[PDB]
Write a protein that binds this ligand. Structure first.
Ligand SMILES: [Cl-]
Ligand SMILES: [Cl-]
Ligand SMILES: [Zn+2]
Ligand SMILES: [Zn+2]
Ligand SMILES: [Zn+2]
Lengths: 217, 218, 240, 201
């Protein structure tokens, strides 16, 4: 196979600023017909990849003219003249001159924005779920930045560990924030022995931890 | 309005075969080449091969030769990709992608339209549909908890696709039981909870589960 | 008299277009028609004078304007494949009651411009058996694989265009008759005396004006953008 | 509504092409005939305003307002006259057009010599076309049954300086089995059609 190598593999950039993604191939990509089939795709989160530049420098119709590509031999570059918030996602360089077609590793473009503290919400388990013998308490951290956030769960003021899992979304295309959901899983019988359920949030946008809580069980 | 609609998600046992289909609309099917590209979770893109639906011409990635078979049925504008002797590291989203070159043009080497993907999990674990619970409510947050399903994925939409703004569907977490769980949330105006109906549409294709959960204030 | 531009046009579904029409005869009445096989001439819109416009039989999807007496432009808001037709502009004095027509605009609307292909042109030299048998020499020209059906075939002998001894098929063949976006083939003949063909000083050219994409249109194919261009094939006289 | 006679009308050269036209609006006062060549625009050739006959060259317009009938006769028909003829009726200064009537004037081939010739591409001898020519207007050319064999309909050329007119149809194909002896096999051609040999190598 022809090995495609991208640089950097992660690219933080403030909107309005230019960006450059380098692509190096292990072989030259000029086909016997004279064309160089070196292309660039952008895969936004939860979506299929989308073609930006085909055959080194040709912008695919519909793509904004802020994207452009150049290169020859084994060195190729994708440029974004002024980065917009919607450019977040993973950039791949692809070669299809020789079989098999090969892609680079991907370069995640990250948008740098102002600090935004999360809106915190807590949700008790539903009554329908409690009938089933399990209790899920959900804590939502909504639209914060940067991605660094800590959620601590407390039941009757006792700090929990090993009974919660979380996941965070990819950076938003419009406001460049992240969102986090954390689930505390207890059995119905343990959930019913306690009154106070609380999630405590530490984020750089908060000058002191924010606690959302509810009483019942 | 070119559209490539792929088949639903599946779980297959190690050693077994999977046949992923991809139905094309909005263009003369025989005129464009159909490629298959796969992506393992959190990983990059890997081209598998292609089929020229006009003459049955195929090209393959050596890495899958002996396991991959690409066929097509012009009467139903569908291209298939069958992958055999499934190994655990064949768990990936499988895409069909249309080459841009019409009528034998060389632009087929770059792709313009892609299917939605078909997530295939190679696993000896049994399929299980999810249970769906409400996450009851200037702005209020509400959502759904989609618990205990296998394999991935579940899709979640709000009000049949009419509520998109402020919606956050989170990546699933693998629980210690071996089953997945995920939440979908939406922030809405607080001065709308007693007027606007909020329903989350959860779909788990591997088990044919389609649930419409009404989320109301307690 | 009545002027119309362009003579030919290929649009993509959803595109906008304005067909120009102009008369230098101080006619009050101007109208637009579309000509389709099966039906006759259907009036789209008419104007009894500057500033006045009215719906004809088929107004849907068409807009007209009469700012001046001279011009009556027809605007296609959003091109649809049902608008593939010949468009005729016409003008009547509207006081004599006679109507005069413009040259016409052949318009094709396609789902995508990748269906557009220019012709390949070839000249086939006179047969030796025909030359001996009849004392005449027939040249045949083929224009093949073109889409849309927007071509003009002319013959050129020694740098000058000829019409005598010429016959071009009034309608092109569909290469794939079952297919809708089928490409076309067109043939022509030029017949001369054997002694005219036998002179090596005589030069024969078959020239095909094709109307396709514009230099500003977007194109992603490996093949050359199928723009408006002339394609020709030539043959020299031979004393064999 | 304006209605015209069923076409195409086949008229031998020298003969009269007879065109009819009936209109529905009884208060109609102006009547016109347009000539439209294939791929060309409708051209006004005749106007008639009162009952009776009006003549102009080889054309004769006839109007009968009582029978709501309009005519166009083309005397001494030439193949030049092959076009669609449209009828148009009005009252004051809209214009009501008919669907048209296509007229096909077949040339008078006094000395036919039917033959099929093989013509080679001036750029490559591999490529060739079969030319069926010099047959009388009594021969009709059937379209191709095969999808990879292309056959064009008969066409009249006129060598004006010699006053010589001739018919011809062209056939070509990339098929390996295609030959000039087979090219026009779907048509009823003269038994004495000349088929010269293509000459080997
Ligand atoms: Cl509670
Ligand atoms: Cl991968
Ligand atoms: Zn506890
Ligand atoms: Zn406890
Ligand atoms: Zn091999």
């Amino acid at each position: 196979d022809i090995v495609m190598t991208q640089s950097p593999l992660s690219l933080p950039v403030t909107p309005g600023e230019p960006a450059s993604i380098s692509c190096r191939s292990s072989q030259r990509l000029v086909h016997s017909n004279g064309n160089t089939y070196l292309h660039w795709y952008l895969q936004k989160p939860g979506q299929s990849p989308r073609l930006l530049i085909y055959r080194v420098s040709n912008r695919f119709p519909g793509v904004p003219d802020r994207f452009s590509g150049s290169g020859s031999g084994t060195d190729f570059t994708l440029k974004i003249s002024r980065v917009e918030a919607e450019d977040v996602g993973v950039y791949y360089c692809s070669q299809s001159t020789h079989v098999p077609y090969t892609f680079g590793q991907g370069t995640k473009l990250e948008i740098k924005r102002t600090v935004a503290a999360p809106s915190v919400f807590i949700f008790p388990p539903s009554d329908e779920q409690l009938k089933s013998g399990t209790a899920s308490v959900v804590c939502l951290l909504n639209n914060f930045y940067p991605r660094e956030a800590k959620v601590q769960w407390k039941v009757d003021n006792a700090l929990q560990s090993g009974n919660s899992q979380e996941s965070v979304t990819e950076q938003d295309s419009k406001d460049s924030t992240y969102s986090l959901s954390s689930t505390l899983t207890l059995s119905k019988a343990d959930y019913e022995k306690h009154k106070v359920y609380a999630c405590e949030v530490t984020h750089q946008g908060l000058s002191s931890p924010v606690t959302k809580s509810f009483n019942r069980g | 309005q070119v559209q490539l609609v792929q088949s639903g998600a599946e779980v297959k046992k190690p050693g077994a075969s999977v046949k992923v289909s991809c139905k094309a609309s909005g263009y003369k099917f025989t005129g464009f080449v159909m490629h298959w590209v796969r992506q393992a979770p959190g990983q990059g893109l890997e081209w598998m091969g292609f089929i020229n639906p006009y003459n049955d011409d195929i090209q393959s990635n050596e890495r899958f030769r002996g396991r991959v078979t690409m066929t097509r049925d012009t009467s139903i504008s569908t291209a298939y990709m069958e992958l055999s002797r499934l190994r655990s590291d064949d768990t990936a989203v499988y895409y069909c992608a249309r080459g841009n070159g019409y009528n034998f043009d060389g632009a087929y080497r770059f792709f313009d339209f892609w299917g939605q993907g078909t997530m295939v999990t190679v696993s000896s674990a049994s399929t299980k549909g999810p249970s769906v619970f409400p996450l009851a409510p200037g702005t209020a947050a509400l959502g759904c908890l989609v618990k205990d399903y296998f394999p991935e994925p579940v899709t979640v939409s709000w009000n049949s696709g009419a509520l998109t703004s402020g919606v956050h569907t989170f990546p699933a977490v693998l629980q210690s039981s071996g089953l997945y769980s995920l939440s979908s949330v939406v922030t809405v105006p607080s001065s709308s909870l007693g007027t606007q109906t909020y329903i989350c549409n959860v779909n788990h294709k591997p088990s044919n589960t389609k649930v419409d959960k009404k989320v109301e204030p307690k | 008299g009545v002027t119309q531009t362009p003579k030919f046009q290929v649009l993509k579904t959803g595109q906008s277009m304005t067909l120009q029409c102009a008369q230098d005869m101080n006619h009050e009445y101007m109208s637009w028609y579309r000509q389709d096989p099966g039906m006759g001439l259907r009036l789209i819109h008419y104007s009894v004078g500057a500033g006045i416009t009215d719906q004809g039989e088929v107004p849907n999807g068409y807009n007209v304007s009469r700012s001046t007496t001279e011009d009556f432009p027809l605007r296609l808001l959003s091109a649809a494949p049902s608008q593939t037709s010949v468009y005729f502009c016409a003008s009547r004095p509207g006081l004599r009651p006679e109507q005069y027509f413009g040259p016409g605009t052949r318009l094709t609307v396609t789902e995508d411009l990748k269906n557009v292909f220019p012709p390949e042109v070839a000249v086939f030299e006179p047969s030796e058996a025909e030359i001996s048998h009849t004392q005449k020499a027939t040249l045949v020209c083929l224009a093949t694989g073109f889409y849309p059906d927007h071509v003009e075939l002319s013959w050129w002998v020694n740098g000058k265009e000829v019409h005598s001894g010429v016959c071009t098929d009034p309608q092109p063949l569909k290469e794939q008759p079952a297919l809708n976006d089928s490409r076309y083939a067109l043939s022509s003949r030029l017949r001369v005396s054997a002694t005219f063909w036998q002179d090596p000083r005589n030069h024969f050219r078959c020239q095909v004006q094709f109307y396709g994409l514009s230099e500003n249109d977007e194109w992603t194919q490996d093949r050359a953008k199928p723009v408006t261009q002339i394609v020709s094939a030539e043959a020299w006289g031979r004393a064999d | 509504e304006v209605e015209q006679n069923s076409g195409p009308l086949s008229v031998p050269e020298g003969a009269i092409a007879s065109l009819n036209c009936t209109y529905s609006d009884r208060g109609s006062q102006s009547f016109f005939w347009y000539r439209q060549y294939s791929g060309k625009s409708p051209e006004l050739i005749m106007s008639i305003y009162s009952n009776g006959d009006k003549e102009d060259g080889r054309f004769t317009a006839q109007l009968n307002k009582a029978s709501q009938y309009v005519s166009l006769l083309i005397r001494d028909s030439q193949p030049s006259d092959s076009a669609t003829y449209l009828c148009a009726v009005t009252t004051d200064s809209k214009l009501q057009f008919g669907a048209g009537t296509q007229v096909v004037v077949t040339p008078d081939i006094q000395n036919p010599d039917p033959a099929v010739y093989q013509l080679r591409d001036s750029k490559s001898s591999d490529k060739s076309v079969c030319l069926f020519t010099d047959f009388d207007s009594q021969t009709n050319v059937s379209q191709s049954k095969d999808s990879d064999v292309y056959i064009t309909d008969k066409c009249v050329l006129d060598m004006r300086s010699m006053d010589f007119k001739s018919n011809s149809a062209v056939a070509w194909s990339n098929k390996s089995d295609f030959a000039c002896a087979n090219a026009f096999n779907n048509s009823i051609i003269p038994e004495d059609t000349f088929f010269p040999s293509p000459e080997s190598s």
